[PDB]
Amino acid sequence: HMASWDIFCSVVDNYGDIGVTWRLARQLAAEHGQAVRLWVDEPQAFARICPRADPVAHVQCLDGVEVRAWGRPWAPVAAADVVIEAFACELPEAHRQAMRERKRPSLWLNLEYLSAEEWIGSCHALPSLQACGLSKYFFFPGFREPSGGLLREAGLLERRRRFQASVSAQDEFLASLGVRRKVGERLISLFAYENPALPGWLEQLRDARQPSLLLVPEGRVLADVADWLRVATLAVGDVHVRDALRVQVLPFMAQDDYDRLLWCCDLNAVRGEDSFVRAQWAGRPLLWHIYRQEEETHLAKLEAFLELYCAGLPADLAENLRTFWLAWNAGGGLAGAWEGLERQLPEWRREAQRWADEQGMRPDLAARLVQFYADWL
């Protein structure tokens, strides 16, 4: 059956809020035939990850999804069969009243943040008893059971395997970005926040024996790269050579093209939550710049994923991995750690493929949301 879904996305900062909700909204419409209304309060952020989007239009239809600007003040409208407040955001008060004035009150879901900590398993799918009687539940994405799983499009890993096994397909996509890899060059993508450990790592890539091509999408990290390159401005299309290191600035591309970029590289430096998972589907080594929180709360979340991700790794590779990520998220000091990871990149790559394929056997989050709604009726 075709049910309507309201997805409220509050862009607090960066792009992961709209990245996850847009990926979810697109998937419910495409491979589940659902009607979706994506409410986003910062349309400029949506236009960054979707170049076809009009950042000034109040409403537009993209890939079967109805994208609406979350205006202030809020205009009352009828509520959908399912209402999702993503990342624990606050719904409009008038929309909660529209959720009750229905023959079947709207299913109310809070799509929580992604974490590998064990506590989210005991909280997933639990009810949130409301004083008004609205049926509310929390939905936790997760890397282990029990949880809501992870967002994964139908046939994603099959398309990633065909792409990585085709040299021509990889060269054609990189050519669309104005990128040509030199023979023997190692491809590394860089998506992060302001990272003080970045110049120390770039020095190691510059002085290394194997050449590296560092592809940097336009973003917050560019100021750190420019200071290390000792140039005033870095524009899309610029290419700088520093001994064995080549740095090329890429444009902020569509979400699906960011996938193909991650699939081309031997090491993906990612951040946040969505690109963190996207790098895992790529089946390639990963560098995670976790969103910094107060009182070092993010360190427990970083260690929780590491303990789960390093289960199948050998001890020395797991140690170099924990040391590098910790230095990547808490000041420089990853010299010996990077040397150790660089020596075991093939083995790391094989374990990254196994981790993606094992995760790829779990039902995806969008399918669990539909099954949750069906079993809730």
């Binding site: 607090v12 990342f87 624990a88 809070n110 929580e112 943040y113 992604l114 974490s115 900590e117 506590w119 989210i120 005991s122 909280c123 639990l126 009810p127 949130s128 008893l129 409301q130 004083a131 008004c132 009687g133 929390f138 939550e273 969103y291 929180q293 107060e294 709360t297």
Partner: protein
């Protein structure tokens, strides 16, 4: 008369959609950014049904203030805990209804507790707001352990066998004896 979900403690009662629920266990979890999650183990105070619920730390619930009566701890039967008032009346409490006391429960406990009642029926027991515990092991603040094995941060000036005060609403160090 509304309270924030992260301010509720074990043994307190909330009115949710006309149903009185006693909070058998409350746990706080830090989610992404500044968001947080409170998981609660509830038991209905008229039908006895048990459930688990989840709230945002900022969600607001309506508390229910209940009658109280001073009670003290005697011993640990199996699998119930027995408490006695000033008139030698026995109150047998299940382990699920004492998650607030179990953190600092001790054999021969001298603390004067308060049993929470709902229509002349005891539902839980609460520790006094300030308790006096002795330090069993320790090396601004450092980690120490009490006689019952609990771990909490105490002042660095403390040593083995010193007397400290604990605020039971937070479970944290308060002061120490000279």
């Amino acid at each position: 008369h509304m309270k924030t979900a992260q301010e509720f403690r074990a043994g307190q009662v909330a009115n949710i959609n006309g149903a009185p629920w006693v909070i058998q266990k409350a746990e706080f979890n830090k989610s992404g950014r500044n968001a947080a999650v409170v998981k609660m183990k509830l038991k209905n105070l008229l039908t006895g049904a048990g459930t688990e619920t989840v709230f945002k730390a900022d969600d607001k619930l309506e508390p229910i203030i209940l009658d109280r009566k001073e009670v003290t701890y005697s011993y640990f039967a199996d699998p119930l805990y027995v408490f006695m008032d000033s008139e030698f009346n026995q109150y047998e409490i299940e382990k699920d209804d004492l998650e607030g006391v179990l953190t600092f429960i001790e054999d021969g406990m001298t603390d004067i507790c308060e049993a929470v009642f709902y229509n002349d029926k005891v539902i839980s027991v609460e520790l006094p707001t300030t308790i006096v515990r002795q330090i069993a092991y320790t090396e601004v603040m450092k980690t120490a352990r009490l006689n019952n094995g609990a771990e909490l941060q105490v002042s660095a000036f403390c040593e083995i066998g010193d007397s400290i005060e604990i605020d039971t609403r937070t479970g944290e160090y308060k002061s120490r004896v000279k």
